[PDB]
Structure formats: structure tokens, C-alpha cells
Amino acid sequence: APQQLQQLHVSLDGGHYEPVTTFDPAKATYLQDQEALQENLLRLCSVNGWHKSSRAACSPRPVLVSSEHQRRWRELHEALVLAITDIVERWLTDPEARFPERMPLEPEEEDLLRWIDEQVPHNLPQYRDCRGSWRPDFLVEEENSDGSGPVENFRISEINARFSFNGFMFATCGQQAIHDMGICDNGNGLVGATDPAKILKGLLRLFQPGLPLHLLKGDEAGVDIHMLVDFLDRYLGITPRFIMPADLRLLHEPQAKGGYKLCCVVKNPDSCDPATLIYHDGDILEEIHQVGLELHQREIRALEPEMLRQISLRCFNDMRTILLVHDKRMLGIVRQELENLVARNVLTLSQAKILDKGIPETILPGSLDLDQAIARCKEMPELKDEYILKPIRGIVFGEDLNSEEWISRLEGLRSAQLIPGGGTCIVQRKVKQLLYDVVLRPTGVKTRYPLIGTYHSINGEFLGVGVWRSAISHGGAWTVSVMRDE
Ligand SMILES: Nc1ncnc2c1ncn2[C@@H]1O[C@H](CO)[C@@H](O)[C@H]1O
């Protein structure tokens, strides 16, 4: 039988580890374990950059992952990158595929994508070269393997790709802490399942640290972004400038990228090189060479169209990542494309089967799938319990609704268009998650919860499994990963 995911207790004075299912806690020291952990989490990120909430929700009891789990995650990722990259590069250039009619975006967004296609490859790369930061989330279900036993299966529920940093600094800080504490890598039979240097170095590849960095953020409060800015300040002497949409300016310029100078207002002008400043129309400006985006889709839509094109030439993530890869419907498009992706030699046959096992069944609005769904549920009302309704741009379970209201919702999804200024739903099969023995808080309360996983990609490269959750922002306990030393 394959080694399962499990949470370990690890003695901080000697390193002896034991599964939580089995550990007799009669003489545990959870409170002092918690304080040691929280001190250590201040190493890469000061109290300035942390939310005290999030630093306190961390658990010194890591999740044990196996080398099979790692091979599984890396393989799913390789197939995912290949499929989604091919789809994105084909979005408007393979018209017979009808992608914008199968997954409609807002019209000013589809205008933006079409402008971007006109810039490739001389002003913007082909998409394979600028995929940026993606962070998929996965759930864990059971599957009858051949192996004649139960094996853990990972289903990607969503790809987080409009922001570039969320999750990255938590994994970096947490893996570095349990290492500094000796939980792993210190001779007790455990090693860290993710290298924090690998993760952080991926982030550093999103931008050139030689040039000044701007971070454009509006209504979003931010979490990992402030931990990165803390680490850059204290360890590298890099100080990115946060700017808001209203701070942006354009100046006419022949000899410049896209015939304009993208600028922003400067709030702290005394601390700047006076030779970097422009006094224009009552504004004190500095120029923007590279900008990281932490904006909502509506905020992006609210930019003046020329302002929006000038951001696209200078921004990470690329607008194709933010608008296409982040959208939950793209998981539906990948499933539609599997047979076509093997016909084009984009996926091997087994890679298509890996993807089909790694993405839950997803029905898109305006699809024939959604039509046969409505028919199948009219002939089998018990079916609605097996599915859910996730929003794109608040999940809704079919077992929590009457059959009359369920066919109603589905009947309203027969067009693929988006509600003006809003979105739509996808219909996804409910994943039956495994339950795990866990001790998440220093209270010592053993419970039996599911595990929510995530992993980190930069420019298509798998960087490591991310933190385990059982959202950290809404209070959730979290931890990181170890492997047997064998
Ligand atoms: N396909 C799915 N089946 C069941 N729950 C889901 C699914 N997609 C998202 N979720 C919910 O969203 C959370 C993670 O986004 C899960 O823990 C679960 O509550």
C-alpha cells in the first residue's frame, strides 16, 4: 500500500517524529512549540510585513509527503502547462476553434488580447516565454488504482494567476522556519519537501532587480506582497514603490516603448534622485519600467485603453495569464481540448489521461455539455447532489437545493456570455475529499478534516508543493511539508 499524506508531531528537543494519529500528547509542549515557530517565522519577514494573524495560524506539525506524491504533482503540472500554453497561443489565432465564443471575456478585454497578438513577438513574447506566476489549488480524493488498493488522487480546483505572490512567501518562510527549528534536515529522518531558496528565487525572476520596481494595487489589501517587500528591503536593499491606478500618467514620446512614457505620481519626492523626477502639469512624476499587477479584473477594465496598453508592455503577470489562465473556465476548456491536444502532438496519450484525472469534470455555460446535463437531471433528479456551482468572477452545492431550483440555475447558464460587469457559473463535479487526522492549533484538539494543497509555478517550472490548509486570510490554520530521508 502507498504511503499516505499524514501530519507528524516532531519533538523540538531531539527531533523524534511520530504521526499525529498515534502520538500520545500526554506530555506534549504545543504552546512552547508555537512560540518557537513564531519567533523563527520572523527571520525572512519582519513583524512589519506579517499579519500577526497569519504568522500565528502556522502549525509546527508538518505534513509528510511521499516521492510518489511529488512525481504526481510534477507530472500533472507538465501536462497542464503544455495544454494551457497551446490554448492561450491559439486563443485568437486558431479561429476555427472558437475559443472566445466558448469562453467569452468582456469586450474591452478581448480587444486587449487582440492588440497583444499584434505585438508578438517583437513587443511582447509569444506566450510560452512569459507565463509568469501560477499557483494551482488541489483537493485530495480516493481512487481505485492495478494497485488493487486505495490511492490518493489530486484534483486541481483553480489556478491562482491574477496576483503573482500569494502563497509564495508563506511557503518560503514556513519551510525556512521548520528547517531553522530542526524539524527537518537535522538528522531525524526528515528533509524539507520544498526548497525555500527555489521558491523565493522564482519570485525574483519575475522582474529585473537592477531597475526600480513598481507595484500597482488598488482595492486589494495584499498579504504575501508585503512579505516580499519586507524581505527585499532588509536583505537586498530593494525598495519597490506601491502605486495606485489614479497615480498613473502617460507622456508622449517617440523614442520609447510603444511611443509613450508610462509614469506615476511620486508621494515621497524628497527621498528620490532629483534627476529621476519629471515636473509635469502640476504632478511630480517618475518613470515606470516594470510593474507588478495586484489588480482586480474590473480595476483593469477601468483603465483608459491607452493606459491599459502601456501597462501590458511593462507588466507581470502578462495580461494573457491574468485574463485567460486565471479564469476558472479555462479548466473546462482544457477538458474540451484533450482529444484535440493529442491529435496535434501537444500531449502524449498518457499526458491526456493525467490531465483528465487531474481536473474535475467541468461543464461550461453555453456548452452542449450543459444541455445534456439539463436533460440528464430532468430524467434523474438525484444527480444534482453529485455536482456544484462555482462562480467565475460562494460555491453552491446541488444537494443543498431542491430539484426545481437546480434545473432553474442550470437553465440560466445556456449562454456562454458574461453578465455585464459580472460573470457566470461553471458546473463542477463534487470531489469526495479524504479526511485526515490533524492537530492544527496549539489547543491540541485532534480533528478529522480534509487537506487543501497548492503548488508553485514560475514560467512553467514546477517549484514545489505549497502550504497545506485545512484560506489563511479568513483565519485558517496552515503548515508546510517534509519527506522521509530515504
Ligand atoms: N470540485 C469541487 N468539489 C468539491 N468542493 C470543491 C470543488 N471545487 C471547489 N470546492 C470547494 O472549494 C474549496 C477550495 O477552493 C474546497 O475545499 C471545497 O470546499
Residue numbers in the entry: 5 to 149, 151 to 398, 404 to 480, 487 to 502
From the paper:
Therefore, the first amide bond between (2S,3S)-t-ES and l-Ile is catalyzed by Cp1B, while formation of the second amide bond between 14 and putrescine is catalyzed by Cp1D. Cp1B is also enantiospecific for (2S,3S)-t-ES and steady-state kinetics showed that Cp1B phosphorylated (2S,3S)-t-ES with kcat/KM (apparent) of 48.0 mM−1 min−1. The X-ray crystal structure of Cp1B complexed with adenosine and 2-morpholinoethanesulfonic acid (MES) was determined to 2.7-Å resolution. Individual substitutions of each residue to alanine either abolished or significantly attenuated enzymatic activity of Cp1B. Hence, although annotated as a HP, our biochemical and structural characterization demonstrated that Cp1B is the biochemically validated example of an ATP-grasp enzyme in fungal natural product biosynthesis.
Here we uncover a nonribosomal peptide synthetase-independent biosynthetic pathway for E-64, which is widely conserved in fungi. The pathway starts with epoxidation of fumaric acid to the warhead (2S,3S)-trans-epoxysuccinic acid with an Fe(II)/α-ketoglutarate-dependent oxygenase, followed by successive condensation with an l-amino acid by an adenosine triphosphate grasp enzyme and with an amine by the fungal example of amide bond synthetase. Both amide bond-forming enzymes display notable biocatalytic potential, including scalability, stereoselectivity toward the warhead and broader substrate scopes in forming the amide bonds.
